[PDB]
């Protein structure tokens, strides 16, 4: 279950086959990593957008607790935004869909 040494998930414009595992209690959605930074290295709003765009749920309606940080516009440096193929993200609460 070492989702790190892969780099072969869902490819996009800048994202080199990078998708994150968005889990919600049991529900899981595949969302592409936020680019416009450094391909494998996403932006600070990455973890925030990953869970948000995962099902179209506003940030204040969920609670992202993963990647060694919390949901926000900016928390921990990008270098700690899960330096891998998206990493894993989970939120506690509900989801607006």
């Amino acid at each position: 279950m070492a989702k790190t040494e892969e780099m072969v998930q869902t490819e996009e414009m800048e994202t080199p086959r990078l998708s994150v595992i968005v889990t919600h209690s049991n529900e899981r959605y595949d969302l592409l990593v936020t680019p416009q930074q450094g391909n494998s290295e996403p932006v600070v709003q990455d973890l925030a957008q990953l869970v948000e765009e995962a099902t179209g749920v506003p940030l204040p309606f969920q609670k992202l607790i993963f990647k060694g940080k919390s949901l926000k516009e900016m928390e921990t440096p990008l270098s700690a935004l899960g330096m891998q193929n998206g990493c894993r993200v989970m939120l506690i609460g509900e989801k607006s869909n």
Binding site: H24, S25, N26, N97
Partner: peptide
């Protein structure tokens, strides 16, 4: 209810004695 998998299958439910579709 407009809640995909919340508490039960998807509706409000009256029994609510089986969290099989609580989130899964």
């Amino acid at each position: 209810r407009y809640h995909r998998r919340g508490g039960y299958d998807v509706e409000n439910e009256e029994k609510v004695k089986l969290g099989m579709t609580n989130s899964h």
